[PDB]
Amino acid sequence: KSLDPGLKKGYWAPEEDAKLLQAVAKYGEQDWFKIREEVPGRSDAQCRDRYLRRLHFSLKKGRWNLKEEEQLIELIEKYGVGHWAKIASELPHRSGSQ
DNA sequence: ATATGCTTACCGTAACTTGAAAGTATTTCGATTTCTTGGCTTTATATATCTTGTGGAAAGGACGAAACACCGTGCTCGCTTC
């Protein structure tokens, strides 16, 4: 993921919306090593988290309404603090990064 | 004029995979051991035969002494010369 002349450190999505989203239907959620051979400028390490955080569906998003605080409470009430504790390993997709 | 907060590029460790080197109880080839089978000597009385030693023979070898070959020589025979 570094010192590579073929990688691109860009920020926007030039051609990515196709080059990376084709893997959605082309290949499953495993063996990312196969896709990196066709998409230039993109590495597997960043590709995994990009694919994950861009196409996910079930996430607590929207405006902070009068009913979201109970959601947060029952979230931190599942197993513990969650954000960094080891319980983060079983919280489904609620990693500390977010 | 700037903070809540999302997005996410790049800096970490944990369990699983693919292949090579070292390591573990298996079987077969080949060497080794041990089961045969016959001989190694010891005795006694018995004996006819048959191959081997102790005779003989003698072919196979050189070295020796006298004879013969010619040829010198003076004897014992010849001669010219005075």
Side-chain angles (χ1 to χ4, degrees):
Chain A
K1 53 165 62 178
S2 60
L3 289 64
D4 311 278
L7 291 177
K8 293 167 78 132
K9 317 320 197 72
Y11 192 15
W12 256 95
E15 311 146 0
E16 172 269 0
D17 311 278
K19 303 272 209 163
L20 192 151
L21 303 196
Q22 54 79 56
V24 176
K26 189 143 171 33
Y27 302 139
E29 186 207 29
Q30 62 79 30
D31 266 357
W32 308 101
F33 204 84
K34 273 272 195 172
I35 305 85
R36 50 156 284 284
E37 291 265 309
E38 291 274 49
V39 183
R42 291 284 172 173
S43 87
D44 160 49
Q46 65 78 23
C47 268
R48 169 159 182 74
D49 49 312
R50 181 164 272 279
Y51 182 100
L52 285 171
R53 303 334 299 182
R54 206 273 202 190
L55 271 77
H56 273 145
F57 44 99
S58 78
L59 318 95
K60 178 223 79 172
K61 323 177 82 58
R63 187 61 197 199
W64 307 98
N65 50 289
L66 191 44
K67 198 202 71 53
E68 215 163 291
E69 66 278 66
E70 300 69 35
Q71 303 333 289
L72 269 291
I73 286 297
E74 69 204 276
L75 172 137
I76 53 154
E77 192 255 329
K78 284 200 171 188
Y79 322 120
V81 305
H83 71 99
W84 283 355
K86 172 63 201 273
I87 52 175
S89 303
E90 69 264 12
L91 289 163
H93 294 225
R94 277 70 170 177
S95 58
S97 177
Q98 219 297 319

